Amino acid sequence: PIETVPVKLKPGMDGPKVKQWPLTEEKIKALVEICTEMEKEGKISKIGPENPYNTPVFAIKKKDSTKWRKLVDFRELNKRTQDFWEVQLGIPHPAGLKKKKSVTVLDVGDAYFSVPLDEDFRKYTAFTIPSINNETPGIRYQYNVLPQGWKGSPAIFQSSMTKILEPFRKQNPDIVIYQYMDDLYVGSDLEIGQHRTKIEELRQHLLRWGLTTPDKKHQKEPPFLWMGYELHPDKWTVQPIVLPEKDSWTVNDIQKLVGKLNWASQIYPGIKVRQLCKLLRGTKALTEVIPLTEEAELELAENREILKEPVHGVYYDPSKDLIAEIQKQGQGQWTYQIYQEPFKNLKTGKYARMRGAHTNDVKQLTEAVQKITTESIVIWGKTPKFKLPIQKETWETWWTEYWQATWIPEWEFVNTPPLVKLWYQLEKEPIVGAETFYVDAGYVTNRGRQKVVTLTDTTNQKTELQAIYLALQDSGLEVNIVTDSQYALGIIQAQPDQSESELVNQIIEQLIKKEKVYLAWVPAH
Amino acid sequence: IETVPVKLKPGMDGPKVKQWPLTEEKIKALVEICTEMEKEGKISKIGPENPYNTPVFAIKKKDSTKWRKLVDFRELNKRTQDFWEVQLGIPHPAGLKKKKSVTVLDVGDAYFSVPLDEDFRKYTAFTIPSINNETPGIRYQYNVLPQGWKGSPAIFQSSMTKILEPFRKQNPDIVIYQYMDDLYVGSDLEIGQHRTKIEELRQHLLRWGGYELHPDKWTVQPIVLPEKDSWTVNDIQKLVGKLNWASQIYPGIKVRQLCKLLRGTKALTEVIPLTEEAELELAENREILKEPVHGVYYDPSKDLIAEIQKQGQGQWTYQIYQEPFKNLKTGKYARTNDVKQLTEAVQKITTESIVIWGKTPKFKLPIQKETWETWWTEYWQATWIPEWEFVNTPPLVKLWYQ
Numbered sequence: 001p002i003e004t005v006p007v008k009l010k011p012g013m014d015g016p017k018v019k020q021w022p023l024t025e026e027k028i029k030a031l032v033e034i035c036t037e038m039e040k041e042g043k044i045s046k047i048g049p050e051n052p053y054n055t056p057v058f059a060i061k062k063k064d065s066t067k068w069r070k071l072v073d074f075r076e077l078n079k080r081t082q083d084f085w086e087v088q089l090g091i092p093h094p095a096g097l098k099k100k101k102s103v104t105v106l107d108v109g110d111a112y113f114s115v116p117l118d119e120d121f122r123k124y125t126a127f128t129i130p131s132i133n134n135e136t137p138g139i140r141y142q143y144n145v146l147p148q149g150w151k152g153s154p155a156i157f158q159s160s161m162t163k164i165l166e167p168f169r170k171q172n173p174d175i176v177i178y179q180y181m182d183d184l185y186v187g188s189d190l191e192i193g194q195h196r197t198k199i200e201e202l203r204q205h206l207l208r209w210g211l212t213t214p215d216k217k218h219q220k221e222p223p224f225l226w227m228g229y230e231l232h233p234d235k236w237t238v239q240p241i242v243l244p245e246k247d248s249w250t251v252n253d254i255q256k257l258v259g260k261l262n263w264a265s266q267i268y269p270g271i272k273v274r275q276l277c278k279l280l281r282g283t284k285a286l287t288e289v290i291p292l293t294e295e296a297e298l299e300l301a302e303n304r305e306i307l308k309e310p311v312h313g314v315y316y317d318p319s320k321d322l323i324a325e326i327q328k329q330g331q332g333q334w335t336y337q338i339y340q341e342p343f344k345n346l347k348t349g350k351y352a353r354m355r356g357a358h359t360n361d362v363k364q365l366t367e368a369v370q371k372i373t374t375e376s377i378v379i380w381g382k383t384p385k386f387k388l389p390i391q392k393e394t395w396e397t398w399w400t401e402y403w404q405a406t407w408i409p410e411w412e413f414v415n416t417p418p419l420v421k422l423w424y425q426l427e428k429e430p431i432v433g434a435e436t437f438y439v440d441a442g443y444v445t446n447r448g449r450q451k452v453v454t455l456t457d458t459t460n461q462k463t464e465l466q467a468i469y470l471a472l473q474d475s476g477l478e479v480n481i482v483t484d485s486q487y488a489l490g491i492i493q494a495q496p497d498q499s500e501s502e503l504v505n506q507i508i509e510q511l512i513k514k515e516k517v518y519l520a521w522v523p524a525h
Numbered sequence: 526i527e528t529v530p531v532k533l534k535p536g537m538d539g540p541k542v543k544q545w546p547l548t549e550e551k552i553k554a555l556v557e558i559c560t561e562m563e564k565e566g567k568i569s570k571i572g573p574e575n576p577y578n579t580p581v582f583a584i585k586k587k588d589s590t591k592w593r594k595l596v597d598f599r600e601l602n603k604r605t606q607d608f609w610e611v612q613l614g615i616p617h618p619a620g621l622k623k624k625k626s627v628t629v630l631d632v633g634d635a636y637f638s639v640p641l642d643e644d645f646r647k648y649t650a651f652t653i654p655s656i657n658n659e660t661p662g663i664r665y666q667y668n669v670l671p672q673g674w675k676g677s678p679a680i681f682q683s684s685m686t687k688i689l690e691p692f693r694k695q696n697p698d699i700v701i702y703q704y705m706d707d708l709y710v711g712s713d714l715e716i717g718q719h720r721t722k723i724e725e726l727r728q729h730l731l732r733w734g735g736y737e738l739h740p741d742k743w744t745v746q747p748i749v750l751p752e753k754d755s756w757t758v759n760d761i762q763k764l765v766g767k768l769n770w771a772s773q774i775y776p777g778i779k780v781r782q783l784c785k786l787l788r789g790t791k792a793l794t795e796v797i798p799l800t801e802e803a804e805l806e807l808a809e810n811r812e813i814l815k816e817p818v819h820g821v822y823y824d825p826s827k828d829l830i831a832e833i834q835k836q837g838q839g840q841w842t843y844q845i846y847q848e849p850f851k852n853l854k855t856g857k858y859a860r861t862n863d864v865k866q867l868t869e870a871v872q873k874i875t876t877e878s879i880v881i882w883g884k885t886p887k888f889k890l891p892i893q894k895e896t897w898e899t900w901w902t903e904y905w906q907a908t909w910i911p912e913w914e915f916v917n918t919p920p921l922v923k924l925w926y927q
C-alpha cells in the first residue's frame with residue numbers, strides 16, 4: 001500500500017468539535033448505508049464515545065441524478081490542519097511540450113480513498129450519523145484514508161502518486177506522465193499499439209496500489225481541450241473564439257471581449273485591443289451601453305478576420321534553438337513570436353507594459369526582451385536568440401549613457417521597419433553661440449529675452465517643465481537651458497520619447513526638432 | 526554524533542521563499558549534485574507535510590569545470606536564533622585587513638561531517654524546480670550542517686578551532702579568519718612563500734578531511750574637483766553645485782566667491798577668469814576634500830549599507846556607510862557587460878566588508894530585479910549572498926562621484 005504522510009494540527013490548536021446539524025430520517029438512513037460501505041471497504045471505521053472531536057456531515061443528490069451522496073464539512077478541520085507544501089499552481093504551457101506520437105489521459109478512481117491517512121490524525125476526522133429513534137446509537141466513525149474536502153488530501157495524494165509512478169517512469173523514460181488532480185496524462189512516441197500497451201502496464205501498476213483507471217473503450221484521447229487550448233499530438237491552438245455580432249455594446253461586453261481578445265494574442269499575432277480598450281473611458285456603470293467608435297468598429301472587424309482562420313502553435317523541438325523576434329506594433333505596443341523553424345510558431349505575444357511615466361523605445365524594447373527571457377526560461381528552460389529592429393550602434397549608445405545597467409542576450413539586428421532609434425540626444429557640452437535660457441513660470445536669456453507668466457491649476461513640478469518648455473518654445477535651433485529643478489532634469493536626461501504627460505510629450509517634440517540642446521542643472525536659492 | 530538543538534528566534538517560523546526559474550543547464554547540474562548528496566546521506570527527499578522552502582542555485586566555480594550548489598539561506602539565517610559568540614565568539618581580527626595579502630578558502634564541505642539537529646531539519650527545505658511545470662519538483666532538506674546557513678560555522682566553530690589551533694601555533698605569523706563557508710587567510714610573506722603556506726593549510730586541512738586579495742593596498746577614493754585651464758560659466762556652475770552638495774559633509778566649504786562669478790545671466794560658455802579672492806576659496810575647499818570627513822566610526826550594531834553607481838564605460842563607484850553621508854569607505858571599480866561587471870563589484874565590495882568589518886553590507890543596486898534575478902547566478906562565485914535592493918539613481922549623485 002502507500003506509505004503514510006504524518007499530519008499534525010496547527011500548533012496550539014486542537015481538533016474540531018462541531019455539532020452535527022439535524023438530519024432527515026430519510027437521510028439518516030441513506031448515510032448509514034453509505035457509511036457502511038465505507039466501513040466495510042475500510043475507508044472509515046466506527047469509533048468509540050471517547051473521541052470528542054467531530055465534524056458535520058451532509059447528504060446531497062448527484063447533480064441531475066437520483067440517489068444519495070455523503071458530504072463531510074471539514075472547513076473547521078482545515079482551519080486547524082497544518083499547511084502543506086501544497087500542489088502547484090503553474091500549469092505547463094502548450095508551446096513547452098514536445099510532440100508525442102500518442103497520448104491518453106486517465107481518470108483515477110477514488111484516489112483519495114485509495115490513500116491511507118496518518119493514524120495520529122485519523123481521530124481528528126471524526127463525525128457522527130444520528131440514530132433515527134430518539135434514544136438509540138448515533139454512530140461515530142473516523143476516516144482511514146484521505147478525506148475528499150480535506151486540506152492535505154491533494155498534496156499527499158499527488159505526493160503519493162509521484163512515489164507510485166517513480167518506478168514505472170524509471171523503466172519507461174520514453175513515456176512522459178503528467179499528474180493533474182485526478183488525471184494522468186501520458187504521452188509517448190511509441191507506435192500506436194506499443195503505446196496502448198504500456199497504457200495497460202500503467203493501469204495495472206496503479207491497480208497494484210488500489211488505483212483504478214478508466215477502461216480503454218471509455219477513456220479519453222485527442223483532441224485534448226485543455227485549459228483554454230485545443231491540444232493535438234502534433235500541434236496546438238486556442239479553443240476557437242467567436243466574436244459576438246452585437247448591435248448594442250455594454251461595458252461588460254467590452255471588458256469581456258477585450259479579455260477574450262488578450263487571450264488569443266498568445267498565438268494569434270496582430271490582435272489589437274486599444275480602440276476597444278478606449279471605449280471604457282469614464283464609464284459609469286457595468287451596464288452602460290457604449291456606442292462603438294469608428295476605429296473600434298474597424299478594429300473589431302479586423303480582429304474577426306484574424307480569428308476567422310484557426311492558426312496553430314507547434315511543439316517544442318528540444319533539438320533546435322529557439323528564436324525570438326520583436327516588432328513595434330505601435331507606440332507602447334510591441335509584438336513578438338517565438339519559433340524554432342522559420343516562422344514555425346511555438347508561441348506569439350504582445351507587450352504594452354509601460355515601466356514608469358516616461359520611457360523610450362530602446363528602454364522599452366529592452367524591457368520587452370527581459371519579459372520574454374523570463375517567460376522562455378519558464379517554458380523551455382532556456383533563453384532564445386533575439387532578432388531586434390535596433391542597431392547595436394543604436395543600442396550600445398543609449399546603453400553606455402544610461403545610469404541603470406542593462407544586458408540583452410546574444411541578439412541579431414533585423415532591418416524590419418519600423419526601426420527603434422533615438423530621436424535626439426542632449427549635447428554633452430554647453431553650446432558655443434547658442435542662446436542661454438535661465439528658467440525658473442518664466443525665463444531670462446543672456447540675450448535680454450524674458451517671459452514671466454502665470455497660470456491656473458498647476459503642480460510644482462509641472463511648473464518646472466513648463467518653463468523649460470517655454471524655453472524650447474521661444475528658442476532657436478540650438479539652446480542651452482539652465483534649471484534648478486532636479487526633477488525636470490532627470491526626466492529629460494533620460495531622453496524619453498514617450499510619456500503619459502502631454503506636456504512632456506510636447507517638450508519631447510521640441511527636442512526632436514532642435515539642432516543642439518544643452519540642459520544643465522543649478523542649485524536652489 | 527550528538528546534535529546541538531538549534532531553534533528559530535521566538536515566535537518565528539520557517540522560510541517559505543519562492544524559487545526563481547532556473548535554466549535547464551542549471552537544473553541538471555543540481556539534479557546531479559543532489560542525487561549524490563542523497564547517496565551520501567547529506568540530504569533527503571521530503572513529504573508534503575513540509576511547507577517550507579529555500580531558493581537553490583547552481584553556480585560554476587572559478588577555475589574548475591565543476592558546479593557548486595548555492596542555497597540562498599538568506600531568510601532562514603535571518604530567522605535563526607543567535608549563538609553566544611561574544612565569549613570566545615571569534616570575533617574579528619583588526620590585523621587581517623592589513624596583513625598584506627590574503628587567500629580565501631571554501632571549507633563548506635567541512636560541514637557535511639556534523640549532523641544537523643533533527644527538529645531543525647525541516648527548515649532547510651529546498652526544491653529543484655522543473656521546466657514548464659511538467660513535474661512536482663525535487664524536494665529535499667538537509668541532514669548535515671548545511672553550507673550557507675549561519676548556524677553551520679557556529680556549531681562547527683568548536684571542532685574548527687580544534688583543527689586549527691596547531692597550524693595557528695605553528696604559523697602565528699598568519700591570520701586565519703572564518704566567515705560562514707569561507708576561510709580568510711592573511712599574511713605578509715612574499716607571494717611564492719605565501720601560496721606555499723596556503724597549500725600547507727590546504728593539505729593540513731585535508732589531514733582531517735583560489736582568490737588572492739591585497740587588503741593593504743585598498744584606499745578611500747575621495748571626492749574630487751575639476752582642475753582646468755580656463756573656467757567657463759558652466760564649469761563654475763557645475764563646480765558650485767558639486768561643492769554645494771559636498772558642503773553638507775565638510776562644513777568648511779565656502780562657495781561665496783564662486784557664486785559671485787555667477788551673478789548675472791551670462792552665456793554658459795563665457796570664460797570667467799578667477800578673481801584671486803575666489804581662487805583661494807577653491808584652494809581651500811580643494812584642501813578640505815583631500816581626506817575623509819573626520820569622526821566617521823563604525824558601529825557594529827548598525828546595518829552596513831552599500832550603494833553603487835554606473836559611472837560609465839565599464840566604471841562604477843560605491844560608498845559604504847551606515848549613516849547617510851557618513852561613508853566608512855568609498856571606492857570605484859573598472860572591468861563583459863553591465864551585469865557581469867555589477868555582480869563582480871558586488872562580490873568584491875562584500876569581500877572587503879567581510880575582511881574589514883566582518884559583515885556583508887546591504888547593497889542598493891542600480892538595476893531591475895528581473896534582470897538581476899536572471900543573470901546574477903551566471904557570474905556569481907561567492908558562497909555567501911548579501912542582501913540587496915534595487916533602486917533608480919538620481920543623475921546628480923553619479924555626477925558628484927568620478
Ligand SMILES: CCOc1ccnc(CCNC(=S)Nc2ccc(C#N)cn2)c1F
Nearest residue numbers: 097098100176178185187224226231232233
Ligand atoms: C492535455 C495535455 O496534457 C499534458 C500536459 C502536460 N504534459 C503531458 C505529458 C506529455 N507531454 C508532452 S512532452 N507531450 C505532449 C504532446 C502533445 C499532446 C497533445 N495533444 C500532449 N502532450 C500531457 F499529456
